[PDB]
Ligand binder design. Structure first.
Ligand SMILES: O=c1cc(-c2ccc(O)c(-c3c(O)cc(O)c4c(=O)cc(-c5ccc(O)cc5)oc34)c2)oc2cc(O)cc(O)c12
Ligand SMILES: O=c1cc(-c2ccc(O)c(-c3c(O)cc(O)c4c(=O)cc(-c5ccc(O)cc5)oc34)c2)oc2cc(O)cc(O)c12
Ligand SMILES: [Mg+2]
Ligand SMILES: [Mg+2]
Ligand SMILES: [Zn+2]
Ligand SMILES: [Zn+2]
Lengths: 326, 323
C-alpha cells in the first residue's frame, strides 16, 4: 500500500537527528519501537552478526512494545523508539568510529529499547511515597530503572523471544552487565555524579589524529555508553523545535496527570506536576540551563566537533523558549 | 519447659546465649521469643506504642518465612544476629549514642536480614539465571529480597508493628533498615571494613569517653558494621556454639555444591564435600574476614569488646593447635 510505502521512506532518515518519529508512530499503527529497532538492526547488520532469526526479533520487539503503556503520554513506546534511534545516531558519530564492539553496540541499542519499559507514568519519588509494590520490591533505590531492566530481560523468556539465543555464554553475561549499568544510569538521581565523571574524562581525554577517542578499561567504555544513553534520553531539547515541543506537551501532560493523582490522594505535588501553578516555558529554560545544557556541552567537548549541530539546536531552542516568556 | 525457656532468656544480654536450646525450648521459635524479650528489655513496645499481639503476630509470620530446611540461613541464625546486635548496641562505648529509632532499626534489620533465604549464594542465583537474580539485576539479590519480604509482611493481618510511628519516623526507619541490610552483602565487606578502619583512625569521643558521631553517614555506617559483625559472629562465640554454626554452614555449602554438580557448573569455594576441609575454611575465614572485622570493631569500642575478641582468637588457636 501507499500506507507502507511512506513509512519506508520516513524510515530512510533512521541515521539522522530529527527523525519523524511521531509520523512513523502513526504510519506503523503505533508500532514505532518495533519498526525502528528492526530497521536499525537491519541497518547495522546485527541479525546476521548475532544469528537473530528475524521473526524472533519481531516477536520480541512486539512483546517489548506491548509492555510500554500506550496511555502514558511521554514514557511510552514512542519515547523508547526515539531514545533507541538517538543512541543509534550517537553511535555512528565520527569520534566514536569502531570504538565499541558489535556486542557493546548491541548493549547500547538494547538498553535504550528497554530503558523505560512498563513505565507507569509516575516518578520514583511518587512510587516511594505511595508505598507502591514497585518501591517495596526494590527498596526505594532506582525503582523504575530496576523494573525496566527486569521486564526487558524477562520478556526474552517468552515463546520465541530470545534474540540472544545464539550468543555465547560470556557474551550473554557481558551484554547483561552492560545493559544493567546503562539503564541504571538513566536514573536522574545519578545525573550529577554521572556528569562529573564525564567532565573528568573530558579533562583528560586522549584522541588519535582524525579525532577518534581512546578508552582503555571497562570503567570508561561503559560510562561513555552510560552518558550516551543518558544524553539520548535527555535529547528532546536538542531535536528540531517542532519535535521538541511535541515532547514538551507530552511530558507536561504526564507530569500533570501525576499531579492530579497526587492531589487526589492529598500528597505534596512534585515539582512540575501542578497544572494550576505551572510555568511550562520557564521550566524548560531552567531544565536546559541547569541539566540538559551542561550534559550536552560536556558531551560535545568529548566528541568535538561531531555534536556541534546537536548543541546548536539546543541553544536555539533555549533562546526560543526564553522568548516565549513575556 | 516454659520455666526453663524463661531462664535461658535471662541471658539475653550476654554473649554466648544458648540460642540453640532456646530454639528447642520455644518450639522452633527462637526469633519470636528473643525479639519479644529484647523489645521488653529495651522497653520498645511502650516507646513506639507497639501492641503486644501485633508484635507476636508479625514475629511469627516473619519467622515462618525463614526456611526450616536450610541448615544455616534460618530463623535460628536470625535470632542469633538479633541477640548479638542487641548486645553490641549495649556496649559502654555507645551509651546514649543512638536514638530509640536507630535502635529499633538495627534490631528490626537484624531480624529480617536473611528472611526467605533459599540456602544458596547470590552468585549461584546469578549463574543459574534465577528469578530472584532476574528481578534484582544481579545486585545484592538476596539482600534486596530479604528487605522486600521483611517489609511486605508488615502488611499482613495485625502485623504492622510500626503502625503508631509517625510518618517521618517510618521514613527514617525504612531508609536505615535498607542501608543496614544491604550492607550485609559480603561483596560490600571490604569497603565497609575500609570505612570502619578510617573511622577508627579518625575516632572521636565526647566528654565521657563515648563514641562521637555527628552525621547520618557515620551513624548508619557504625550500625551497618555492627549488624555485619553480628552476622559474622559465629567464630567469636563459645566454641560449642561456634562448632554448631560451622557444621550448619558447611552442610548448606555442600548442598549448594551438590546442585552445582547436578548442573556441571564449577563448584564454588568450600561447597565441594569431596574436596572440602572444614578446618582450613575456618582458619582462612577467620584470618581474612572475621578477625580483621572484629579487631577493627574492637578498636572502635575499645576495650568494650575484648572478651569477644579474646574468644575469637582462642577459637582461632583451637584450630591452629588441632589442624
Ligand atoms: O537540579 C535540578 C534537577 C532537575 C531535575 C531533576 C529530576 C528530573 O526528573 C528532571 C526532569 C526530567 O527528568 C525530565 C524532564 O523532561 C524535565 C522537564 O521537562 C522539566 C524539569 C524541571 C524544570 C524546572 C524545575 O524547577 C524542576 C524540574 O525537570 C525535568 C529535572 O531539574 C532542575 C531544574 C531547574 O530549573 C534547576 C535545577 O537545579 C534542576
Ligand atoms: O569473599 C569472601 C566471602 C566469604 C563469605 C561469603 C558468604 C558467606 O555466607 C560466608 C560465611 C558465613 O556467612 C558464615 C560462616 O560461618 C562461614 C564459614 O564458616 C566459612 C566461610 C568460608 C570460608 C572460606 C571460603 O573460601 C569461603 C567461605 O564462609 C562463611 C563467607 O568468605 C570468604 C572467606 C575467605 O577465606 C576469603 C574470602 O575472600 C571470602
Ligand atoms: Mg527512565
Ligand atoms: Mg544474608
Ligand atoms: Zn527515558
Ligand atoms: Zn546472615
Amino acid at each position: 500500500t501507499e500506507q507502507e510505502d511512506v513509512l519506508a521512506k520516513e524510515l530512510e532518515d533512521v541515521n539522522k537527528w530529527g527523525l519523524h518519529v511521531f509520523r512513523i508512530a502513526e504510519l506503523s499503527g503505533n508500532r514505532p519501537l518495533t519498526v525502528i529497532m528492526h530497521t536499525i538492526f537491519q541497518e547495522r547488520d546485527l541479525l546476521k552478526t548475532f544469528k537473530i532469526p528475524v521473526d524472533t526479533l519481531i516477536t520480541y520487539l512486539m512483546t517489548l512494545e506491548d509492555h510500554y503503556h500506550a496511555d502514558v503520554a511521554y514514557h511510552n513506546n514512542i519515547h523508547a523508539a526515539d531514545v533507541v534511534q538517538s543512541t543509534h545516531v550517537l553511535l555512528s558519530t565520527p569520534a566514536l568510529e569502531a570504538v565499541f564492539t558489535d556486542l557493546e553496540i548491541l548493549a547500547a541499542i538494547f538498553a535504550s529499547a528497554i530503558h523505560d519499559v512498563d513505565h507507569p507514568g509516575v516518578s520514583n519519588q511518587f512510587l516511594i511515597n505511595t508505598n507502591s509494590e514497585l518501591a517495596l520490591m526494590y527498596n526505594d533505590s532506582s525503582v523504575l530503572e530496576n523494573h525496566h531492566l527486569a521486564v526487558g530481560f524477562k520478556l526474552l523468556q517468552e515463546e520465541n523471544c530470545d534474540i540472544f539465543q545464539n550468543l555465547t555464554k560470556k557474551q550473554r553475561q557481558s551484554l547483561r552487565k552492560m545493559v544493567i549499568d546503562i539503564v541504571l544510569a538513566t536514573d536522574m538521581s545519578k545525573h550529577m555524579n554521572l556528569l562529573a565523571d564525564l567532565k573528568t574524562m573530558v579533562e583528560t581525554k586522549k584522541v588519535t589524529s582524525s579525532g577518534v577517542l581512546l578508552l582503555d578499561n571497562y570503567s570508561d567504555r561503559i560510562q561513555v555508553l552510560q552518558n550516551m544513553v543518558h544524553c539520548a534520553d535527555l535529547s528532546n531539547p536538542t531535536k528540531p523545535l517542532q519535535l521538541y515541543r511535541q515532547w514538551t506537551d507530552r511530558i507536561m501532560e504526564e507530569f500533570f496527570r501525576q499531579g492530579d493523582r497526587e492531589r487526589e490522594r492529598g500528597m505534596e505535588i512534585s515539582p512540575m506536576c501542578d497544572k494550576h501553578n505551572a510555568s511550562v516555558e520557564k521550566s524548560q529554560v531552567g531544565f536546559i540551563d541547569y541539566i540538559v545544557h551542561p550534559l550536552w556541552e560536556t558531551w560535545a567537548d568529548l566528541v568535538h566537533p561531531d555534536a556541534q549541530d546537536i548543541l546548536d539546536t539546543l541553544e536555539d531552542n533555549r533562546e526560543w523558549y526564553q522568548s516565549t516568556i513575556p
